[PDB]
Paper text:
The structure of the complex REChHK6-BeF3−:Ct_HPt comprised one molecule of each protein in the asymmetric unit (AU) and had an interface area of 835 Å2. However, loop β4–α4 seemed highly mobile with scarce electron density and side chains could not be traced. The phosphomimetic BeF3− was stabilized in the active center by interactions with the phosphorylatable D1221 (distance between Be and O atoms is 1.76 Å), residue K1271, a water molecule, and a Mg2+ ion, but surprisingly, it was not bound to the conserved T1249 at the end of β4. Also, the phosphomimetic maintained a distance of 3.3 Å (between Be and N3 atoms) from the phosphorylatable H105. Meanwhile, the Mg2+ ion was stabilized by additional interactions with the phosphorylatable D1221, residue D1172 in loop β1–α1, the main chain carbonyl oxygen of Q1223 and two water molecules. The majority of contacts involved α1 and loop β1–α1 in REChHK6 interacting with αB and αC in Ct_HPt that were supported by peripheral contacts between loop β3–α3 and loop β4–α4 interacting with αC and αD, as well as between loop β5–α5 interacting with αA and αC. In our complex structure, we have trapped a transition state where phosphorylated REChHK6 is bound to Ct_HPt just before phosphotransfer takes place, similarly as observed in the complex structure of RECSc_Sln1-BeF:Sc_Ypd130.
If the HK incorporates a REC domain (REC-1) is denoted as hybrid [name] (hHK), and the first His-Asp phosphotransfer event occurs in the same polypeptide chain. In fungi, the HPt accepts the phosphoryl group from REC-1 domains of various hHKs upstream of the signaling pathway and forwards it downstream to REC-2 domains present in at least two conserved RRs, Ssk1 and Skn7. Also, we have obtained the crystal structures of Ct_HPt alone and in complex with REChHK6 bound to the phosphomimetic BeF3−, as well as the crystal structures of REChHK3 and RECCa_Sln1.
Numbering used by the authors:
A (entry chain B): 44 to 173
B (entry chain A): 1163 to 1284
The structure:
Amino acid sequence: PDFGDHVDTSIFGQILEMDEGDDHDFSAPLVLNFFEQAEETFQKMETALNNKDLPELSKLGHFLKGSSATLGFTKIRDSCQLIQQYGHGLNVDGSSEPDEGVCLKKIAEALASARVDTVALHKMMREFFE
Amino acid sequence: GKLRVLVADDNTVNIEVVSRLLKLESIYDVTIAKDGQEAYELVKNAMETGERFDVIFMDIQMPNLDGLQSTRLIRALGYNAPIVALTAFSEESNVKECMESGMNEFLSKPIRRPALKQVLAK
Ligand code: BEF
Ligand SMILES: [Mg+2]
């Protein structure tokens, strides 16, 4: 299907090659599992923001970065990269942010992007896999 | 003939991908660890029962005990077979601390058949 900027086709295509057939025997469960994982991860991130645990958020960002990276979900991966860095108190340019508030805020902004892009991608996928 | 492999990661998505790639390479005896404490326990058990893991795949970041620390403990036990890092690179020299911890080879997510095969050949 037409995924847009939501999926790197080359990387996602390699996942489809891991199917034994055209029935998406491997791919469809895997992408289904990812969405379960994504939702749970987002919920653990919200708790961590509430507890204002930047280290926990850094680990959660990195956690989901690996699964989104494997499936070629670049938008979610990049938001996850940002949550990993801001959780380390790191800006994009590599500088340290002393202002915890800014880190918390920017993590929330990146999490918002991830939730939106996840919903968008959930439809594209639910169609394609059928 | 048959390889006995340990895969340690906290992310089931990455586990299932690695497991498929291993199955494609005719490797079926694959044990899973969800964190680095389980990984240590499994290697300890494996040495206690005399069943050697021929290779370990070790994610870096995991709850309870991370991959770096698990690897150091594993080397401390006297397990001397290869350990391969499953990484999601945010830096380049991240490998140095990994090698200092006892890891041998390096795979960066996304993991694919070409790179896994090169590791297994050696
Ligand atoms: F959690 Be691992 F370092 F991808
Ligand atoms: Mg991990």
